[PDB]
Each structure stands twice: as C-alpha cells, then as structure tokens.
Design a protein around this ligand. Sequence first.
Ligand code: A1LZ6
Ligand code: CL
Ligand code: CL
Ligand code: CL
Ligand code: ZN
Ligand code: ZN
Ligand code: ZN
Length: 311
Amino acid sequence: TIKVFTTVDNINLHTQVVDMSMTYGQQFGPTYLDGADVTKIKPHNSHEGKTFYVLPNDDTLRVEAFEYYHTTDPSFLGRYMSALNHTKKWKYPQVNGLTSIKWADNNSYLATALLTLQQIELKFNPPALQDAYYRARAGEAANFCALILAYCNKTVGELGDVRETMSYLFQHANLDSCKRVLNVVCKTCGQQQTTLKGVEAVMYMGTLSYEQFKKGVQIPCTCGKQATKYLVQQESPFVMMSAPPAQYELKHGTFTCASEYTGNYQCGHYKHITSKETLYCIDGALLTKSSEYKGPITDVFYKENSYTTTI
Ligand SMILES: Cc1ccc(N2CC(N3CCC(C)(O)CC3)C2)cc1C(=O)NC1(c2ccc3c4c(cccc24)C(=O)N3C)CC1
Ligand SMILES: [Cl-]
Ligand SMILES: [Cl-]
Ligand SMILES: [Cl-]
Ligand SMILES: [Zn+2]
Ligand SMILES: [Zn+2]
Ligand SMILES: [Zn+2]
C-alpha cells in the first residue's frame, strides 16, 4: 500500500492508504492527477503523498464541492479535469502586460475573453473561479481556462463565441448590484420605462456604440411599429456592446477593448483590440500596434460607473 490524499477542492485534504494491487477506481471511484484520469491505473510508488481529485461520493465532499465551485453537478469535476489536461499544456505568454494564450485547440475565443477579463472589473462568486482568476492575472491561467470551459459547458477544441462565453461568465459573477434603465417610445403605445438588473444590465446586442445606445436605437414595438429605445440610467463598472461582425472604426481612448472577428460564422478567428497609449492587436502570442484602426468588430467593452441621461 501507499498513502495519498484525496480532495474535491485542493484545500481540504482527506488522508487515504491505497492497496497497490487495486486500481484507484476500485477504491475511490473516478480519480484524477493534474487533470489526468487515473481511474484505471493502480497505485505507483512515486504517487506516494500526492493529492488526487475525486468525485463527490459522500455528503461532506458534496458540500465542500458546492462551497468551492457552487455546483451540485456531479459531472462538473470530470469536465474540469478533461479541460485541464489540455489547458495545463497551453502557453500563457505575457503580451503588453496581459496574460494571453498561445494558439491551441481552437482557443482564440478564450484568449480574447481572458484578455478582456483582465481589463474589466469583475468578482466571480465561486471561490474556485475567483482564485483561478487571481492566479491567471499573475500568469498561471491553466486552471482558470479549464474552469471557464467547465462553467460554460464547453469542451476543448469546440468553437466558441466570445459574447456567449462572457455572458455565461457574467452569470457566475457579482453583477446583482448592477442596474440599467431604458425608456422606449412608440408613437402608438406611448412611452414606457424598463429596469434591468444583473447580466442583462451590462450587455446589449444590436450596436457596438455606447453613444448610440444613449442617443437611441430603433427597435420594434409590440404595436408592429418601430419604437426608439434609449439608455436612461446605467449603474455598472463596464458595459459590453455587441453586434454581428462588421467593419468599424476604433479610436484610442474611447473604449477599453474589443473583439475582432474575421471569417465565416462559427469557424473564424478572434483577435483582441485593446486601447492603451495606442491601439494594440493581441492575437494569442502575437502583438501588433497601430495609431488607427478599421476592422471587423463584434464586441466593444467600455468602462462605466454611473451614468444618468439628459432626456
Ligand atoms: C464564433 C462562433 C462560435 C459559436 C457560435 N454559435 C454557438 C451559438 N449558439 C450557441 C447557443 C445558442 C443556441 O443559445 C445561441 C447560438 C451559435 C457562433 C459563433 C460566431 O461566429 N459569432 C460571431 C458571428 C459571426 C458572423 C455572424 C454572426 C451573426 C450573429 C451573431 C454572431 C455572429 C450573423 O448574423 N452573422 C453573419 C460573433 C463572431
Ligand atoms: Cl450558486
Ligand atoms: Cl455562481
Ligand atoms: Cl466551412
Ligand atoms: Zn453595481
Ligand atoms: Zn407600441
Ligand atoms: Zn487585428
């Protein structure tokens, strides 16, 4: 036999002694080491003392798993480990003071998302995700990237939409204090206010321009007529404006960052535009810069705190 530790969170370790004749899966159930499924492997001698992730099979571990991940999903941990087996082999270069990702396993949309999250103000509710976010800012982003995949119900190599990913991530973040007040004006039905909170208060699909949203955008009413929707009041640390890819002018100092997308629906390539002393285009490990920009943009992020309209 040998002595090992099992865990669901890598915080609360539970001591174990494994008979070196039986496979870990005989003893503990599905078992993992640094993201690698060891369920059908028998204890080795170098394994001595190491920590093994297991699935939550008693109530103590179900509660420790909810406390760290905010999940009751019994599949969650295996989806995290499947992803980590890849993300731990990715490279995370520093590019322009930001943790990026060298291209692999179709991960351009995760790189763009990772770069964006470093430039906006966000607190994740699950500890596991907040801790991995901190460790990623500091350059070690494998666990964060694996957790993003698991929390978005996405696998390595699958094609991802940045806006869909940020939306899923926002739903696991503390945006509950965030508020948006809209006013719609239809010539038939009249004028009507609406208040949005949470993730709906920070995302809009339809235009890339925050200014345009403040000035008003044409939408359909329930009258079968086109009303105008404008922003009355915004209370959040950022807003995300999206629209189907299209050519768009970006000027330094007027936005925080943007998603550039080139190619066909679903199988194109994301790049990240960020506004610093000049405009930087971060493409995984590649960096380019330009004083001006015109290109195909599909999301733009803007800093906010409190905005109130002038009617
Ligand atoms: C990269 C990518 C990966 C995956 C997906 N999908 C999974 C989605 N699916 C998931 C779950 C759901 C069912 O709930 C909602 C739909 C669809 C989409 C894209 C993608 O290409 N997104 C962009 C884009 C390019 C060109 C576009 C558009 C259009 C509309 C919206 C986006 C878009 C549009 O009209 N054109 C001509 C932004 C780059
Ligand atoms: Cl929850
Ligand atoms: Cl959550
Ligand atoms: Cl194709
Ligand atoms: Zn708020
Ligand atoms: Zn109306
Ligand atoms: Zn570019």
